[PDB]
Write a protein that binds this ligand. Structure first.
Ligand SMILES: Nc1ncnc2c1ncn2[C@@H]1O[C@H](COP(=O)(O)OP(=O)(O)OP(=O)(O)O)[C@@H](O)[C@H]1O
Ligand SMILES: Nc1ncnc2c1ncn2[C@@H]1O[C@H](COP(=O)(O)OP(=O)(O)O)[C@@H](O)[C@H]1O
Ligand SMILES: Nc1ncnc2c1ncn2[C@@H]1O[C@H](COP(=O)(O)OP(=O)(O)O)[C@@H](O)[C@H]1O
Ligand SMILES: [Mg+2]
Ligand SMILES: [Mg+2]
Ligand SMILES: [Zn+2]
Ligand SMILES: [Zn+2]
Lengths: 98, 398, 692, 196, 49
């Protein structure tokens, strides 16, 4: 119930903007970032879950990551066989998603 | 495997370890943690990887030489002459194993008529409550409450099980907290000396694998064998822990697990096993500031976790008086020890008699009488009512 | 000569075969019925492959076979198998198409010594042991009747029987006379079921001062997967040496390894009864009182756990709005209130319940990880306790002691109902549809009535908000309650030495009712009353804002609905009525009010006495008033006198006035009530007084 | 069926561009609507038959090379045996020991004269996978069971670890000769490692 | 920051530094607003759902 403006903001979030590289090699962000501050019980988490389901690519996480997955990527070296391993984080696992 | 005892150690030397082999009927005896005398032979057994350098070796007396195309080179020549490396090790074979110093009906039958006479004489004395306090602790002055508590912990209670699958503790655990030099480690040392199966450990000296258990592979067969820790060697005995605060929090977690479940679970090296640890714990701890603060509760004076704090049956607190006449009474005893090396002791019962009586006494499983039910109910009611607001705060809460 | 030597020769072999055939054909029970008749008939009805024989009957009928059985098991078992196969094929001719062999297993025996006593004397004999299973290798295809392909030509060598002692090595190809090599014809070979088990002594039977010992056993054919790890079993088997590789040769003494080969293992109207119990008008109170027989008091907690166990119903219109039906429970209590016993009972009752502790060293972890298992030595993905309890209950003890990872995983599993894993090249999402029940202690070690629930507990507000029901167990010195609790404890201790609700249902009946209600009861909300709910919600929010702390939110209403559904599931109602709604209202209001501090709680309790009094007892309220007055008098006596007096007395006028304030004008039934006598109260008309 | 498919493909696409006359092999995959069965139901009776099983993939090894046609050479006379067909699955091959050439008057070749020529062999892709029982169907209080899977040619890289897959295959055993048991444990007799 | 919004305090209700807040495009603030007749509609909508 309610939040028509909020729903429209979420829709334009889902569609997203357009990214633009430049001749100098510099880039400019083409994606939208939103913040929602509110009292408990204001139906915020449900919108996030609906966005996660609606978008073709979507990851839902909290602060400090998830149960067994971090929020950012990390790099290690295998001592037995020398290979540079990288662990996918919640941000790396999404490309073009929400 | 056997080890050389401490009394035989020379200056600055680690105890010697030896391997003993049991055949047929003698196989049964000599369990882990014992202190036993062996009688047998000393025998030489070959070894493989002793010689990284060439040494004494065997050969054949035949005067045989090679022929062209079959010349006695290294490998073929060594194999043709049957050369074997003479390496050896020392192994003890045992034919008699005995205790160094030696089911209630079985215990009664084992004892002789004179031993049973002594046991019966001990049995019907009220001074048994008093004299046992003085016998085990002749030199320590005062602190009779701690002596009584330690004796009660030694005798222990009765374990029971319920119909729902739960189990109830039958052991008693004791903690002592006190100011410096209040004979706090003397009780631990005396209990270690008296008890036949007791292990004394300091907080930081013992590791996690030192307690609990370890798993290693059998030398010959495919099976596995278990190395017992301090708690397993002290099974159905007393474990003494000095400087209880110095133990790691995770070691304290393991100790609490052993105190609650009374079971050690091992899942390592392809072996899953459960072992029984029915130990009674005697622990000594220091105040946080090095002295007991009279203005604060017990929970604010010790750095111990709440669960293990609640698991302990009894806490004893020792505080040193400054200039009371006891300073004289203490001194008179101490010099009495130095002036009289062995003649200043008036023990009533020898330690062996006490051990025999304790072994006989631990077999009993007394029940709870009907009047005792109501008496305990009313006494617990009074104890809880003591917690009322009409009187000052107490260290505990009931 | 040895027993096996006499067994080997053909004469006594055929004679014993005939004797066993006659024993099979002529054996009858104590009532004259042919035992093997019914046995083989019921075996035939399910196309089974095994037959069970008792040593007692075998010894009674034919003594020589029983005498020879222990000291020559393999050949005698083979002969008995042949005889049984002949008899069965005589009874039915179709098994030549179905099963070409039948095994004979010995069921009962004179009990043989434990694992300690097995020594050289028991080699190649028949023994019976008891132990505890610790590991299993799974099911493995072993060879039997092997066909080999020659590698020079392509001839197929005939079937060879695979003995358990040595591998089969064919001599030469019958046609080209080659000496090898040969390989196994995979398509034409026959295979058998094989499993390996490790058995350890029961820890209760081990004498003090020594350690439990273990031994290995092998199960074949129908015996596979008949035991779970951690169970207690009894085997009848053969103590064996003659298998290749038993002798230690490379180094050390000439030591042999022993193995045991086992051949036996020894560990409609209900729906009508459920409907009949549902027909009873007071089934709900029976179920409420049926929970936790061994715990005294805490009736409200048991009532809440009833709804938690029965549960609700998830709802998801389309694939957009998911709403769970699992009712989580949180308990916060002072030490000694027996919070863990509730979790133990719930684990015992629940069909699928997982238990874990946050302090550390738990048997089951709370976080998924990929690891080589220490026992099976296999690369496994071990999910947490949350994943394992799909459509089940997860229990967490010592909720405050949990570290960062456990809190994060619990928050993710409670709010999203799924667990995400990104470890060792594995990216997964797993379902965590489970009900969470937790127990905890306050921050200072004692609950403070002057502070809110959040200030008393180490947990955070987002975690608390997830739980539908919060229960607070505060320890307070009540002499009568303490006396009753002590009486129960001492009675339990004495009983277990080695030498309101009319009647609770049996535990198995309760389990069956729970299963049936979960499977076949789906209450419908087609008769809800929105007007009363909306008005009550508005009034609750209004007075919450008037007090000025912790306002109510829509989430609570959802919980109410779920609880209502749970209540409708208790009575097997297919539709929701006002009684369930009012009960859920009472539960939700109690939970909400109990989390407030002193003044706010008192004001809310006084104002909302209308709703909280649904199906309540006036006598209980009067008892509460009397207890409050008694406590006030006792506190005054203790503060002024410095000690309690021998008697407690209270005028009736104060009780009457307070009852009038709660709109109660008669108290004779309260005087005659059982609650009055249980607390040892008396009423004297000679002085118009109440004495305790 | 693969030979029939190759012949049909030759029939339909005869006028190919010049130079590429070589007709290559064709892999035939299977698919069905039959409902699956539990992995726990796999027992001795299902050997060398066709089974359908669900699972979750937890490990996938690297793609390697396996030979299907080999050619070997003799030490002395340098004669060659060509176009020897290898068997599919985890099965090996044993080289012959005798040189099969008629030589009268000439001296003869020694014993075991054959060497494998690597540059004259046909190779295909090879992969092994590890499959675990579904958590949705694992019995309460029981450790999950595992299985090893063999992937050949075009089936490689179709599955990423973490996916939930349904697999149709043949239940088999490895065949690397009658090797002796190893290790300090020798209880098991006549056990061949199984796979799908 | 305090668990529930405090309108009169204005600022200091948000703990984030302005640097991280700059990266957001739109910021929404939601409050539990007292409306006696709106609660009836919300309850009816919820029960209807
Ligand atoms: N109402 C009761 N009925 C029966 N036993 C009780 C009751 N209250 C407490 N007990 C007993 O009190 C003892 C306290 O141990 P228990 O593990 O139950 O405590 P807990 O409440 O979980 O405490 P903690 O906060 O330390 O985890 C138990 O042996 C339990 O049987
Ligand atoms: N306007 C609304 N319409 C429908 N449902 C609502 C509305 N407001 C609240 N709810 C219900 O209340 C719950 C709100 O919880 P949640 O969204 O998790 O709160 P928050 O996002 O603040 O943590 C949801 O489950 C939702 O079903
Ligand atoms: N009450 C006492 N009676 C006899 N000797 C005592 C007494 N108190 C202290 N002592 C002596 O003082 C020393 C105390 O040291 P110790 O007990 O090791 O201190 P702590 O255990 O606190 O580290 C002991 O050697 C003991 O001989
Ligand atoms: Mg000391
Ligand atoms: Mg507890
Ligand atoms: Zn051949
Ligand atoms: Zn050649």
């Amino acid at each position: 119930f309610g939040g028509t403006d909020m729903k429209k903001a979420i829709a334009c979030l889902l569609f997203g903007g357009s990214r633009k590289r430049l001749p100098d090699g510099l880039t400019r962000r083409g994606d939208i970032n939103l913040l929602m501050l509110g009292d408990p019980g204001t139906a915020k988490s449900q919108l996030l879950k609906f966005v996660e389901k609606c978008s073709p690519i979507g990851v839902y996480t909290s602060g400090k990551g998830s149960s067994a997955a971090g929020l950012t990527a990390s790099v290690m070296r295998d001592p037995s066989s020398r290979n540079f391993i990288m662990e996918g984080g919640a941000m790396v696992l999404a490309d073009g998603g929400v | 495997r056997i080890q050389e005892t401490q009394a035989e150690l020379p200056r600055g030397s680690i105890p010697r370890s030896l391997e003993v082999i049991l055949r047929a009927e003698a196989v049964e005896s000599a369990q882990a943690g014992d202190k036993c005398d062996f009688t047998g032979t000393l025998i030489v057994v070959p070894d493989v990887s002793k010689l990284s350098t060439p040494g004494a070796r065997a050969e054949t007396n035949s005067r045989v030489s090679g022929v062209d195309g079959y010349e006695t080179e290294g490998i073929r020549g060594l194999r043709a002459l049957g050369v074997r490396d003479l390496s050896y090790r020392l192994v003890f074979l045992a034919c008699c194993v005995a205790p160094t110093n030696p089911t209630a009906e079985s215990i009664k039958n084992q004892m002789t008529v004179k031993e049973w006479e002594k046991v019966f004489e001990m049995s019907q004395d009220k001074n048994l409550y008093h004299n046992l306090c003085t016998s085990l602790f002749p030199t320590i002055h005062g602190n009779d409450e701690v002596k009584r508590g330690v004796l009660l912990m030694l005798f222990g209670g009765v374990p029971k099980t319920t119909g729902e699958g739960t189990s109830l503790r039958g052991d008693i655990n004791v903690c002592i907290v006190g100011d410096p030099s209040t004979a706090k480690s003397q009780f631990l040392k005396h209990v270690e000396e008296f008890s036949p199966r007791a292990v004394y450990t300091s907080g930081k000296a013992s590791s996690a694998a030192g307690l609990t258990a370890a798993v290693v592979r059998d030398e010959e067969s495919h099976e596995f064998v278990i190395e017992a820790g301090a708690l397993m060697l002290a099974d159905n005995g007393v474990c003494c822990i000095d400087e209880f605060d110095k133990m790691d929090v995770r070691d304290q977690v393991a100790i609490h697990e052993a105190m609650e479940q009374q079971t050690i679970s091992i899942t390592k090296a392809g072996v899953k096993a459960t072992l029984n640890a029915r130990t009674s714990i005697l622990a000594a701890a220091n105040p946080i500031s090095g002295h007991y603060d009279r203005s604060k509760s017990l929970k604010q004076n010790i750095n111990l976790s709440a669960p293990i704090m609640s698991r302990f049956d009894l806490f004893f607190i020792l505080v040193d008086e400054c200039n009371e006449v006891t300073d004289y009474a203490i001194a008179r005893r101490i010099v009495d020890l130095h002036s009289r090396i062995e003649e200043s002791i008036d023990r009533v019962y020898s330690l062996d008699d006490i051990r025999r009586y304790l072994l006989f006494a631990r077999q009993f499983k007394p029940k709870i009488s009907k009047e005792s039910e109501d008496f305990i109910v009313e006494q617990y009611k009074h104890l809880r009512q003591r917690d009322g607001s009409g009187v000052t705060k107490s260290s505990w809460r009931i | 000569h040895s027993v096996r030597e006499w067994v080997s020769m053909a004469g006594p072999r055929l004679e014993i075969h005939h004797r066993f055939k006659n024993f099979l054909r002529t054996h009858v029970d104590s009532h004259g019925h042919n035992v093997f008749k019914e046995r083989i008939s019921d075996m035939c009805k399910e196309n089974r492959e095994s037959l069970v024989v008792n040593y007692e009957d075998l010894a009674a009928r034919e003594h020589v076979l029983a005498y020879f059985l222990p000291e020559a098991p393999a050949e005698l078992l083979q002969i008995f198998d042949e005889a049984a196969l002949e008899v069965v094929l005589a009874m039915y001719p179709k098994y030549d198409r179905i099963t070409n062999h039948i095994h004979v297993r010995i069921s009962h025996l004179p009990l043989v010594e434990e694992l300690r006593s097995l020594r050289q004397l028991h080699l190649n004999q028949l023994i019976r042991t008891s132990g505890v299973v610790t590991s299993c290798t799974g099911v493995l295809p072993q060879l039997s009747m092997v066909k080999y392909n020659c590698n020079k030509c392509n001839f197929v060598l005939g079937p060879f029987c695979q003995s358990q002692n040595q591998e089969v090595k064919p001599g030469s190809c019958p046609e080209c006379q080659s000496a090898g090599p040969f390989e196994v014809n995979m398509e034409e070979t026959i295979y058998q079921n094989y499993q390996r088990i490790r058995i350890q002594e029961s820890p209760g039977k081990v004498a003090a001062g020594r350690l439990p010992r273990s031994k290995d056993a092998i199960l074949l054919a129908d015996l596979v997967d008949s035991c779970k790890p951690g169970d207690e079993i009894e085997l009848t088997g053969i103590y064996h040496n003659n298998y290749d590789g038993s002798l230690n040769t490379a180094n050390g003494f000439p030591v042999f390894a022993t193995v045991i080969l086992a051949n036996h293992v020894a560990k409609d109207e209900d729906v009508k009864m459920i409907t009949s119990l549902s027909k009873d008008q007071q089934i709900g109170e029976k179920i409420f009182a049926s929970i936790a027989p061994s715990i005294y008091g805490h009736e409200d907690i048991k009532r809440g756990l009833a709804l938690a166990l029965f549960g609700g119903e998830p709802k998801n219109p389309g694939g957009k709005h998911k709403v769970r039906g699992d009712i989580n429970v949180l308990l916060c209590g002072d030490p000694g209130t027996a919070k863990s016993q509730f979790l133990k009972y719930i684990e015992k009752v629940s069909s699928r319940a997982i238990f874990t502790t946050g302090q550390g060293a738990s048997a089951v972890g709370l976080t998924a990880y990929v690891q080589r298992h220490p026992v099976s030595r296999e690369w496994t993905l071990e999910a947490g306790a949350l994943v394992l309890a799909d459509r089940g209950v997860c229990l967490i003890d010592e909720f405050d002691k949990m570290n960062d990872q456990d809190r994060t995983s619990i928050h993710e599993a409670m709010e999203q109902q799924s667990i995400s894993i990104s470890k060792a090249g594995i990216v997964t999402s797993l379902q965590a549809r489970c009900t969470v029940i937790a127990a905890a202690n306050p921050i200072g070690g004692r609950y403070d009535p002057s502070l809110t629930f959040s200030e008393n507990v180490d947990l955070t507000e987002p975690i608390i908000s997830r739980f539908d029901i919060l229960c607070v167990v505060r320890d307070t010195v009540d002499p009568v309650q303490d006396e009753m609790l002590a009486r129960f404890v001492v009675g339990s201790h004495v009983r277990h030495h080695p030498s309101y609700g009319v009647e609770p249902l049996p535990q198995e009946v309760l389990k069956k009712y729970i299963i049936y209600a979960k499977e076949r009861v789906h209450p419908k909300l087609n008769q809800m009353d929105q007007d009363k709910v909306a008005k009550m919600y508005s009034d609750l929010r209004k007075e919450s804002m008037a007090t000025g702390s912790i306002p109510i939110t829509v989430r609570h209403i959802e919980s109410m609905i779920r609880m209502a559904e749970a209540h409708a599931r208790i009575h097997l109602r297919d539709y929701v009525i006002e009684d369930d709604v009012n009960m859920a209202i009472r539960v939700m209001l109690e939970s909400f009010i109990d989390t407030q501090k002193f003044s706010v709680m008192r004001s809310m309790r006084k104002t909302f006495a209308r709703y909280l009094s649904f199906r309540r007892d006036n006598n209980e309220l009067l008892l509460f008033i009397l207890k409050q007055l008694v406590a006030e008098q006792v506190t005054y006596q203790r503060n002024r006198f410095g000690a309690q007096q021998d008697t407690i007395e209270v005028p009736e006028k104060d009780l009457v006035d307070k009852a009038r304030q709660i709109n109660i004008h008669n108290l004779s039934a309260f005087y005659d009530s059982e609650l009055f006598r249980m607390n040892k109260f008396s009423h004297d008309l000679k002085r118009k007084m109440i004495l305790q | 069926l693969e030979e029939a498919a190759k012949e049909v493909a030759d029939e339909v696409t005869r006028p190919r561009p010049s130079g590429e006359e070589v007709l290559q092999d064709i892999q035939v995959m299977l698919k069905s609507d039959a409902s699956p069965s539990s992995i726990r139901s796999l027992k001795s009776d299902m050997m060398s038959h066709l089974v359908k099983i669900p699972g979750i993939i937890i490990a996938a090894s690297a793609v390697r090379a396996k030979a299907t046609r080999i050619s070997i050479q003799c030490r002395s006379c340098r004669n060659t045996l060509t176009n020897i067909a290898m068997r599919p699955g985890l099965e090996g091959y044993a080289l012959p020991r005798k040189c099969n050439t008629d030589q009268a008057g000439r001296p003869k070749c020694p014993l075991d004269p054959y060497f494998i020529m690597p540059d004259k062999c046909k190779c295909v892709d090879f992969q092994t996978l590890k499959l675990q029982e579904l958590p949705d169907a694992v019995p309460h209080g029981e450790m999950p069971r595992h299985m090893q899977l063999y992937c050949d040619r075009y089936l490689c890289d179709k599955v990423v670890p973490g996916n939930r897959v349904t697999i149709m295959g043949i239940y088999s055993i490895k065949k690397f000769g009658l090797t002796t048991s190893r290790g300090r444990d020798r209880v098991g007799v006549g056990i061949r490692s199984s796979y799908i | 920051v305090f668990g529930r919004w405090d309108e009169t305090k204005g600022e200091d209700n948000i703990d984030f530094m302005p640097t991280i807040l700059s990266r957001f495009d739109m910021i929404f603030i939601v409050k539990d607003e007292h409306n006696e007749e709106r609660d009836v509609m919300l309850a009816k909508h919820v029960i209807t759902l």
